[PDB]
Amino acid sequence: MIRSENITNNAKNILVQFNTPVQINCTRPNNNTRKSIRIGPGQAFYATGDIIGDIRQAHCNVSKATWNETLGKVVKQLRKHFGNNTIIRFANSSGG
Amino acid sequence: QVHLQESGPGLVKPSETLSLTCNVSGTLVRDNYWSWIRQPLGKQPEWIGYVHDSGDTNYNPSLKSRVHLSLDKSKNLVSLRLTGVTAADSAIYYCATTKHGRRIYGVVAFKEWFTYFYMDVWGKGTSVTVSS
Amino acid sequence: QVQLVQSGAVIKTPGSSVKISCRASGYNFRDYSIHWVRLIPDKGFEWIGWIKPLWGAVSYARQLQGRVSMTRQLSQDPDDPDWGVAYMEFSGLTPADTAEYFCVRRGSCDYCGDFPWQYWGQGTVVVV
Amino acid sequence: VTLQCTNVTNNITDDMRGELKNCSFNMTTELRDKKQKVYSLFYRLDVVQINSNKEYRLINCNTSACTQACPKVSFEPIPIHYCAPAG
Amino acid sequence: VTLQCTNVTNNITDDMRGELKNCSFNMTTELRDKKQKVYSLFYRLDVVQINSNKEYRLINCNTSACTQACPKVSFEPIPIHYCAPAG
Amino acid sequence: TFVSVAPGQTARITCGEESLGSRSVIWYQQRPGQAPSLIIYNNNDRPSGIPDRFSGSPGSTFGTTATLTITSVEAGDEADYYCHIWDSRRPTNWVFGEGTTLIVL
Amino acid sequence: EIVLTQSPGILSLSPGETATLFCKASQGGNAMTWYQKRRGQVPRLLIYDTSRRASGVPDRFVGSGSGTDFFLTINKLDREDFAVYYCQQFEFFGLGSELEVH
Ligand SMILES: *[C@@H]1O[C@H](CO)[C@@H](O[C@@H]2O[C@H](CO)[C@@H](O[C@@H]3O[C@H](CO[C@H]4O[C@H](CO[C@H]5O[C@H](CO)[C@@H](O)[C@H](O)[C@@H]5O)[C@@H](O)[C@H](O[C@H]5O[C@H](CO)[C@@H](O)[C@H](O)[C@@H]5O)[C@@H]4O)[C@@H](O)[C@H](O[C@H]4O[C@H](CO)[C@@H](O)[C@H](O)[C@@H]4O[C@H]4O[C@H](CO)[C@@H](O)[C@H](O)[C@@H]4O[C@H]4O[C@H](CO)[C@@H](O)[C@H](O)[C@@H]4O)[C@@H]3O)[C@H](O)[C@H]2NC(C)=O)[C@H](O)[C@H]1NC(C)=O
Ligand SMILES: *[C@@H]1O[C@H](CO)[C@@H](O[C@@H]2O[C@H](CO)[C@@H](O[C@@H]3O[C@H](CO[C@H]4O[C@H](CO)[C@@H](O)[C@H](O)[C@@H]4O)[C@@H](O)[C@H](O[C@H]4O[C@H](CO)[C@@H](O)[C@H](O)[C@@H]4O)[C@@H]3O)[C@H](O)[C@H]2NC(C)=O)[C@H](O)[C@H]1NC(C)=O
Ligand SMILES: *[C@@H]1O[C@H](CO)[C@@H](O[C@@H]2O[C@H](CO)[C@@H](O[C@@H]3O[C@H](CO[C@H]4O[C@H](CO)[C@@H](O)[C@H](O)[C@@H]4O)[C@@H](O)[C@H](O[C@H]4O[C@H](CO)[C@@H](O)[C@H](O)[C@@H]4O)[C@@H]3O)[C@H](O)[C@H]2NC(C)=O)[C@H](O)[C@H]1NC(C)=O
Ligand SMILES: *[C@@H]1O[C@H](CO)[C@@H](O[C@@H]2O[C@H](CO)[C@@H](O[C@@H]3O[C@H](CO[C@H]4O[C@H](CO)[C@@H](O)[C@H](O)[C@@H]4O)[C@@H](O)[C@H](O[C@H]4O[C@H](CO)[C@@H](O)[C@H](O)[C@@H]4O)[C@@H]3O)[C@H](O)[C@H]2NC(C)=O)[C@H](O)[C@H]1NC(C)=O
Ligand SMILES: *[C@@H]1O[C@H](CO)[C@@H](O[C@@H]2O[C@H](CO)[C@@H](O[C@@H]3O[C@H](CO)[C@@H](O)[C@H](O[C@H]4O[C@H](CO)[C@@H](O)[C@H](O)[C@@H]4O)[C@@H]3O)[C@H](O)[C@H]2NC(C)=O)[C@H](O)[C@H]1NC(C)=O
Ligand SMILES: *[C@@H]1O[C@H](CO)[C@@H](O[C@@H]2O[C@H](CO)[C@@H](O[C@@H]3O[C@H](CO)[C@@H](O)[C@H](O[C@H]4O[C@H](CO)[C@@H](O)[C@H](O)[C@@H]4O)[C@@H]3O)[C@H](O)[C@H]2NC(C)=O)[C@H](O)[C@H]1NC(C)=O
Ligand SMILES: *[C@@H]1O[C@H](CO)[C@@H](O[C@@H]2O[C@H](CO)[C@@H](O[C@@H]3O[C@H](CO[C@H]4O[C@H](CO)[C@@H](O)[C@H](O)[C@@H]4O)[C@@H](O)[C@H](O)[C@@H]3O)[C@H](O)[C@H]2NC(C)=O)[C@H](O)[C@H]1NC(C)=O
Ligand SMILES: *[C@@H]1O[C@H](CO)[C@@H](O[C@@H]2O[C@H](CO)[C@@H](O[C@@H]3O[C@H](CO)[C@@H](O)[C@H](O)[C@@H]3O)[C@H](O)[C@H]2NC(C)=O)[C@H](O)[C@H]1NC(C)=O
Ligand SMILES: *[C@@H]1O[C@H](CO)[C@@H](O[C@@H]2O[C@H](CO)[C@@H](O[C@@H]3O[C@H](CO)[C@@H](O)[C@H](O)[C@@H]3O)[C@H](O)[C@H]2NC(C)=O)[C@H](O)[C@H]1NC(C)=O
Ligand SMILES: *[C@@H]1O[C@H](CO)[C@@H](O[C@@H]2O[C@H](CO)[C@@H](O[C@@H]3O[C@H](CO)[C@@H](O)[C@H](O)[C@@H]3O)[C@H](O)[C@H]2NC(C)=O)[C@H](O)[C@H]1NC(C)=O
Ligand SMILES: *[C@@H]1O[C@H](CO)[C@@H](O[C@@H]2O[C@H](CO)[C@@H](O)[C@H](O)[C@H]2NC(C)=O)[C@H](O)[C@H]1NC(C)=O
Ligand SMILES: *[C@@H]1O[C@H](CO)[C@@H](O[C@@H]2O[C@H](CO)[C@@H](O)[C@H](O)[C@H]2NC(C)=O)[C@H](O)[C@H]1NC(C)=O
Ligand SMILES: *[C@@H]1O[C@H](CO)[C@@H](O[C@@H]2O[C@H](CO)[C@@H](O)[C@H](O)[C@H]2NC(C)=O)[C@H](O)[C@H]1NC(C)=O
């Protein structure tokens, strides 16, 4: 189901909710060391220590087939408010 | 079958231009990266570097200026051209072939991987020192 | 969860002194009165000692006053008040005391008294 | 405090921009009169270049000094059952 | 603050351990830029030895800095009559 | 650096800096007075021209030094070995490590 | 001092059944406690304050009794329980009751 405040206003957020979940695995592989520095009396500041292992970039993963099928389901239930001969595409965000 | 064959003048003057080449047997220069390694006497050797057609010609940044690597696609040989010799190049010099690979440690599509070379064969070694 | 770690098994010489740690983490430390016990080969049990760690007040069984002490160390930081370390300093060894020692807690049960000990440590044998 | 900061000891390629800045700085110690030189790793979205020499500062420090989370307190959401009062 | 501290001027015998340590230290003044050298007597259950030279610190200062009692407020117990609410 | 091992025993030769990334060590065998040669071309993969008992270090752990283990050393292993590291975190070492030599009784 | 005595001592029985240990303090009214110990491991608790078991132990173990007489009942003797079993108040312990595969 989609839900809206109302669809034809382009300021209020169309929010869509679906049935089957999409399992998303997200990870940081950079192995971190905690280090305590005492600031003064009892102010135990915490910092990163040394990076061991191999330095990478943290990243999220989703499966392809569930994403393609759930995007098919949300474009199927999003076409009902707009007429049936409607090309629907998706972009990323634009600024901010 | 492979065998290699270096060359050098050997006994040369300081501040000069040194040119060495290496010979082929069976294979060509198109199919493999080639590599040049020098070695001072009783010391650890030093890799000058490697060469390939189509731009795959990264040098050592230690020397970086006085070196020139080149192929010979007609004569099917490989050649180095050194200029301005100092006494630190008193060395056995070496031509070599190498094969590459992909050491891969993370995601492949974030460029979190690198290459290794390894020099499988060597030449005969040519003692070129510099004196008067 | 409530975890107790001991130290490894020490073979010793007669007349010497041993120090067995007992490091506890996983719970609010200053509620629970900690106890120390022995298991001899084929003798069943006997109890050594007990220590309240809010001030470290101790007591013993009758055959161990004046050769054994137990101290404790609290946590001196305002982030983790959970973990405590008890030391058992043991002097005056003899072939009779060839045994394994366990440090042990009153658990968090609703029908606890005091003395029903629940969580136990993994045990250290010492032979002289 | 003003930071003295460098790269982390990493094989740098020109296209990938470095995500770790290894900064070291002056910090007070438990005694107020002695001070220590300490070092930390920071992420590049939390440090700015103040104006050869590369001295840096934390990003919040021209807004408001601000608060460390305690590592006692967790961040995972427990459920909340909302419920209605009498009437 | 790091203390510079000595015995109190007393006839010392070897068996009796001295209960007073006379310490002088740096302390700030009302203006933040001037600082004064001041001296106090302290009891030896409140001063520990940090590591010829004998420099000392207060015992609490690797735990938490802590609070002076006000000399307005007294310490003697007034009685409290506990009493029951309605019902 | 000049570890002299009697034959039939087990040699363990170390070289190079401690590991800071995933490591791709190359070991070289050097016949004395002749040309050098290759012996180990990945961490623990051997190519042809040489049999087993040259076990390379697993480079997968962190904070280790490159160990090359030989068992049942013979007189043909009177050679000079060269470590050559290819780390992830470091730049490319264009210069090999130290000259370590194995002497057989 | 207060001395204990357990009733079976050594026992060599069959699986699947019920078994009542009985312990016998010398002055009554006590807070009775029960312990199951495997050989060479940590002893963990069964029963505190004569009746009530802990969390995470199976409900086949029930303690019972009063006064000077305390029963430890196990119904449906499973394969796990070939161990030794102790009973205690505070600073003493029993001799050790053992239940064996036969
Ligand atoms: C989100 O999605 C992304 C999208 O995929 C996920 O990304 C993947 O993530 C994983 C983990 O993060 C990455 O794995 C790491 O990289 C490699 C990948 O292995 C590939 O390459 C190996 C080498 O290929 C070469 O050889 C083969 C023939 O052997 C040849 O075909 C090829 O062209 C090339 O020439 C292949 O061996 C490897 O196959 C492996 O996996 C297959 C399927 O799983 C299996 O069928 C094979 O049999 C084999 O097992 C694959 O093609 C891994 O190799 C790497 O593991 C290294 O790193 C860790 C960290 O240190 C270490 O623990 C490992 O032991 C291993 O280190 C070895 O690397 C060197 C290889 O030479 C060797 O020198 C080292 O010493 C070490 O070798 C050790 O093990 C061997 C084997 O027992 C032993 O002989 C040695 O003595 C020594 O003990 C990592 O796992 C993926 O690359 C990445 N991308 C892709 C496209 O998959 C991401 O995970 C997702 N996120 C989440 C949270 O899920
Ligand atoms: C972020 O930036 C900080 C700088 O503020 C870096 O910290 C320094 O990093 C270097 C690199 O590791 C350290 O230098 C190394 O010190 C080792 C130990 O030295 C300490 O101990 C001796 C006493 O034993 C003191 O004299 C000394 O001052 C240090 O306190 C040495 O062993 C190292 O030598 C290396 O080479 C020899 C060659 O034979 C080998 O045998 C050794 O095994 C070793 O590999 C080296 O000199 C330096 O100590 C660090 N300073 C501090 C204060 O820690 C951080 O590294 C950087 N962050 C990251 C993640 O890299
Ligand atoms: C969110 O995530 C997406 C993808 O997950 C990101 O999208 C891509 O972002 C990159 C930039 O970060 C886009 O640009 C590409 O970058 C290449 C990097 O090359 C650098 O290095 C060389 C040499 O060092 C320089 O010459 C070069 O200018 C760069 O400095 C470029 O090389 C690419 O160039 C393309 O065009 C030229 C000719 O125009 C060709 O020569 C190249 O071969 C190549 O085809 C390219 O510009 C990339 O395009 C983005 N992807 C898409 C699909 O658009 C987002 O950036 C990311 N956003 C955030 C905020 O995280
Ligand atoms: C609580 O209160 C009680 C009493 O109120 C205290 O108990 C007494 O404490 C003292 C220690 O403080 C015990 O020890 C005695 O101290 C004497 C001090 O001599 C010192 O100086 C000389 C020379 O400088 C040194 O040689 C000596 O070693 C000391 O450094 C000792 O001399 C005493 O020795 C006894 O034995 C030797 C031989 O063994 C003889 O030569 C002596 O003459 C003497 O008989 C003695 O050791 C004293 O014993 C305690 N009293 C009791 C009854 O036990 C507690 O200490 C106190 N506790 C706290 C925490 O406040
Ligand atoms: C640490 O990171 C550095 C980042 O520069 C990295 O050096 C580069 O490594 C790669 C592979 O090891 C070198 O090879 C390139 O790979 C592609 C693959 O097809 C080729 O197309 C490249 O040719 C271009 O790049 C050269 C860069 O100067 C140009 O000179 C050339 O004309 C082409 O434009 C090339 O073969 C790459 O050359 C180096 N770059 C430098 C500057 O050395 C290094 O390998 C990493 N080291 C470790 C230990 O991780
Ligand atoms: C703290 O103090 C005492 C001593 O350790 C102990 O109190 C004991 O309480 C029970 C009951 O509260 C007393 O038991 C009585 O004794 C006669 C002896 O003939 C018995 O008939 C009875 O005991 C059982 O009967 C109850 C029903 O009436 C049962 O429900 C119960 O399980 C009893 O076992 C009778 O009640 C007992 O005499 C006192 N002990 C003394 C010395 O007075 C108390 O339990 C201790 N608490 C802890 C936590 O150890
Ligand atoms: C905050 O500061 C307080 C004082 O500045 C610290 O209090 C002190 O804490 C130590 C423990 O760290 C107590 O014990 C001392 O420890 C040393 C080391 O013990 C070694 O010797 C024994 C002897 O056999 C050996 O078995 C051990 O394994 C050790 O190797 C001893 O040498 C001392 O004599 C003393 O026993 C102090 O008693 C205690 N002092 C005071 C005044 O409280 C406190 O720990 C600090 N807190 C933090 C978090 O740093
Ligand atoms: C949403 O997706 C679009 C489609 O790709 C993104 O547009 C592209 O974004 C990159 C990153 O800004 C642009 O690359 C260029 O990189 C150089 C490197 O420093 C930089 O100097 C340039 O100014 C520019 O940033 C790329 O040109 C751009 N493509 C187009 C057609 O504009 C967009 O960034 C994405 N939005 C977000 C927030 O990621
Ligand atoms: C941590 O604190 C120390 C102590 O203040 C800092 O060291 C001091 O840094 C200043 C820079 O503002 C140094 O001044 C400069 O000295 C050079 C000669 O070394 C002189 O040519 C310049 O004109 C300038 O005056 C100062 O010398 C130095 N203190 C000492 C005793 O040498 C330090 O910068 C702080 N940060 C780190 C990361 O250590
Ligand atoms: C109160 O504050 C004053 C002002 O800082 C302190 O005086 C200073 O103490 C330092 C010790 O950390 C002195 O440094 C030493 O000086 C000697 C020569 O006198 C030199 O040989 C040593 O190498 C060391 O550098 C410093 O000179 C001194 N300041 C002055 C102006 O003389 C003082 O310690 C604090 N405490 C008390 C109890 O007064
Ligand atoms: C997210 O991670 C989980 C485990 O961390 C993955 O679940 C495994 O998936 C593989 C692929 O079918 C199975 O062989 C395993 O048995 C699964 N394990 C568990 C514990 O479920 C899951 O696939 C990951 N998500 C994605 C999109 O790859
Ligand atoms: C150290 O980090 C600095 C940045 O903090 C790097 O310096 C420049 O980074 C930009 C990336 O935006 C590159 O385009 C420039 O070419 C870099 N300048 C130089 C002189 O390299 C720098 O690469 C890092 N490494 C070193 C060794 O300085
Ligand atoms: C000043 O106080 C110090 C301690 O703060 C005294 O020094 C030592 O005190 C111990 C007592 O535990 C004696 O056993 C030592 O013999 C003392 N050392 C010396 C050199 O005397 C010291 O006695 C006090 N007085 C003086 C004049 O320094």
Side-chain angles (χ1 to χ4, degrees), chain G residues 1 14-15 22 24 29 31 33 39 41 48 59 63-64 77 86-87 93-94:
Chain G
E1 83 172 37
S14 158
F22 152 70
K24 192 173 158 192
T33 316
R39 175 75 82 85
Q41 282 182 62
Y48 39 84
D59 56 332
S64 39
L77 205 58
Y86 305 109
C87 47
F93 271 96

Short mmCIF file of all heavy atoms in Angstrom, two decimals, chain G residues 1 14-15 22 24 29 31 33 39 41 48 59 63-64 77 86-87 93-94:
data_model
loop_
_atom_site.label_atom_id
_atom_site.label_comp_id
_atom_site.label_asym_id
_atom_site.label_seq_id
_atom_site.Cartn_x
_atom_site.Cartn_y
_atom_site.Cartn_z
N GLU G 1 28.47 -27.93 65.66
CA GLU G 1 28.25 -27.71 64.25
C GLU G 1 27.18 -28.66 63.72
O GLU G 1 26.83 -29.64 64.38
CB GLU G 1 29.56 -27.88 63.48
CG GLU G 1 29.91 -29.31 63.15
CD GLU G 1 31.10 -29.40 62.23
OE1 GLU G 1 32.02 -28.59 62.38
OE2 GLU G 1 31.11 -30.29 61.35
N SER G 14 18.47 -47.09 36.59
CA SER G 14 17.91 -47.14 35.25
C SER G 14 17.41 -45.76 34.82
O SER G 14 17.01 -44.96 35.67
CB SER G 14 16.75 -48.15 35.22
OG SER G 14 15.85 -47.89 34.16
N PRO G 15 17.45 -45.43 33.53
CA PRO G 15 16.90 -44.15 33.08
C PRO G 15 15.38 -44.17 33.06
O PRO G 15 14.73 -45.20 33.23
CB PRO G 15 17.44 -44.01 31.65
CG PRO G 15 18.50 -45.00 31.53
CD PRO G 15 18.15 -46.11 32.44
N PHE G 22 17.01 -38.07 49.86
CA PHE G 22 16.54 -37.55 51.12
C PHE G 22 17.76 -37.13 51.90
O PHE G 22 18.75 -37.87 51.97
CB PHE G 22 15.69 -38.60 51.86
CG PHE G 22 15.71 -38.48 53.36
CD1 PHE G 22 15.09 -37.42 54.01
CD2 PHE G 22 16.31 -39.48 54.13
CE1 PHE G 22 15.11 -37.33 55.40
CE2 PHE G 22 16.33 -39.39 55.52
CZ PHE G 22 15.72 -38.32 56.15
N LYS G 24 19.02 -35.01 55.64
CA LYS G 24 18.58 -35.07 57.02
C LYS G 24 19.48 -34.19 57.87
O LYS G 24 20.50 -34.66 58.39
CB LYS G 24 18.62 -36.51 57.50
CG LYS G 24 17.94 -36.78 58.80
CD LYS G 24 17.91 -38.27 59.06
CE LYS G 24 17.75 -38.57 60.52
NZ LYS G 24 18.01 -40.00 60.80
N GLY G 29 14.16 -26.69 60.30
CA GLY G 29 13.66 -25.40 59.86
C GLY G 29 14.50 -24.67 58.87
O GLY G 29 14.26 -23.48 58.63
N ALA G 31 17.04 -23.47 55.57
CA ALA G 31 16.95 -23.18 54.15
C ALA G 31 17.77 -24.20 53.37
O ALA G 31 18.99 -24.16 53.34
CB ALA G 31 17.47 -21.77 53.87
N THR G 33 19.19 -26.39 50.18
CA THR G 33 19.68 -26.03 48.86
C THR G 33 20.18 -27.30 48.18
O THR G 33 20.72 -28.18 48.85
CB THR G 33 20.77 -24.97 48.98
OG1 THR G 33 20.40 -23.97 49.94
CG2 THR G 33 20.96 -24.26 47.71
N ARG G 39 31.46 -34.46 36.80
CA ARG G 39 32.83 -34.77 37.20
C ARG G 39 33.81 -33.92 36.40
O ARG G 39 33.82 -33.97 35.17
CB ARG G 39 33.12 -36.24 36.98
CG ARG G 39 34.54 -36.58 37.27
CD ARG G 39 34.81 -36.61 38.76
NE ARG G 39 34.41 -37.88 39.35
CZ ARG G 39 35.18 -38.97 39.39
NH1 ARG G 39 36.40 -38.96 38.87
NH2 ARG G 39 34.72 -40.08 39.94
N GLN G 41 33.96 -30.56 36.31
CA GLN G 41 33.40 -29.33 35.78
C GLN G 41 32.88 -28.44 36.91
O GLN G 41 33.04 -28.73 38.10
CB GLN G 41 32.28 -29.63 34.78
CG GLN G 41 32.74 -30.05 33.39
CD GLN G 41 31.57 -30.28 32.45
OE1 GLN G 41 30.81 -29.36 32.15
NE2 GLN G 41 31.41 -31.52 32.00
N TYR G 48 17.08 -23.65 45.19
CA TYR G 48 17.29 -22.78 46.35
C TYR G 48 16.05 -22.73 47.22
O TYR G 48 14.93 -22.78 46.72
CB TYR G 48 17.65 -21.35 45.94
CG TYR G 48 16.90 -20.83 44.75
CD1 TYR G 48 15.63 -20.28 44.88
CD2 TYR G 48 17.47 -20.87 43.51
CE1 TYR G 48 14.97 -19.80 43.79
CE2 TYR G 48 16.81 -20.42 42.40
CZ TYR G 48 15.56 -19.88 42.55
OH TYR G 48 14.89 -19.41 41.45
N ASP G 59 12.32 -28.59 34.35
CA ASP G 59 11.30 -28.66 35.39
C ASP G 59 11.02 -30.07 35.88
O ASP G 59 10.13 -30.25 36.72
CB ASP G 59 10.01 -28.06 34.88
CG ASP G 59 9.56 -28.72 33.62
OD1 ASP G 59 10.43 -29.22 32.88
OD2 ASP G 59 8.34 -28.76 33.36
N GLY G 63 12.35 -29.94 44.29
CA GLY G 63 12.74 -30.15 45.67
C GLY G 63 11.53 -29.99 46.56
O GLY G 63 10.61 -29.24 46.24
N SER G 64 11.54 -30.69 47.69
CA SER G 64 10.39 -30.71 48.56
C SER G 64 10.85 -31.05 49.97
O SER G 64 11.99 -31.47 50.19
CB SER G 64 9.39 -31.73 48.05
OG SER G 64 10.11 -32.85 47.58
N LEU G 77 14.08 -39.87 34.49
CA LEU G 77 15.54 -39.81 34.50
C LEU G 77 16.10 -39.88 33.08
O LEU G 77 16.12 -40.94 32.45
CB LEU G 77 16.11 -40.95 35.35
CG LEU G 77 17.50 -40.70 35.93
CD1 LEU G 77 17.49 -39.45 36.79
CD2 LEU G 77 17.98 -41.90 36.73
N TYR G 86 24.64 -32.95 45.44
CA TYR G 86 24.90 -32.49 46.80
C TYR G 86 23.71 -31.72 47.34
O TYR G 86 22.95 -31.11 46.60
CB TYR G 86 26.11 -31.57 46.92
CG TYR G 86 27.38 -32.12 46.37
CD1 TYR G 86 27.91 -31.59 45.20
CD2 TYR G 86 28.07 -33.14 47.02
CE1 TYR G 86 29.07 -32.05 44.68
CE2 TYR G 86 29.25 -33.62 46.50
CZ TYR G 86 29.73 -33.07 45.32
OH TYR G 86 30.89 -33.52 44.76
N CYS G 87 23.61 -31.71 48.66
CA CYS G 87 22.66 -30.89 49.38
C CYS G 87 23.42 -30.07 50.41
O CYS G 87 24.43 -30.52 50.96
CB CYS G 87 21.64 -31.76 50.06
SG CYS G 87 22.42 -33.09 50.90
N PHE G 93 28.41 -29.22 53.66
CA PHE G 93 27.96 -29.89 52.46
C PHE G 93 27.72 -31.34 52.80
O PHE G 93 28.16 -31.83 53.83
CB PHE G 93 28.99 -29.74 51.36
CG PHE G 93 28.81 -28.53 50.54
CD1 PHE G 93 29.53 -27.38 50.80
CD2 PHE G 93 27.93 -28.54 49.49
CE1 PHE G 93 29.34 -26.26 50.05
CE2 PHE G 93 27.75 -27.43 48.72
CZ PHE G 93 28.44 -26.30 49.01
N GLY G 94 27.03 -32.02 51.91
CA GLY G 94 26.84 -33.44 52.09
C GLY G 94 28.05 -34.24 51.69
O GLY G 94 29.08 -33.71 51.28
#
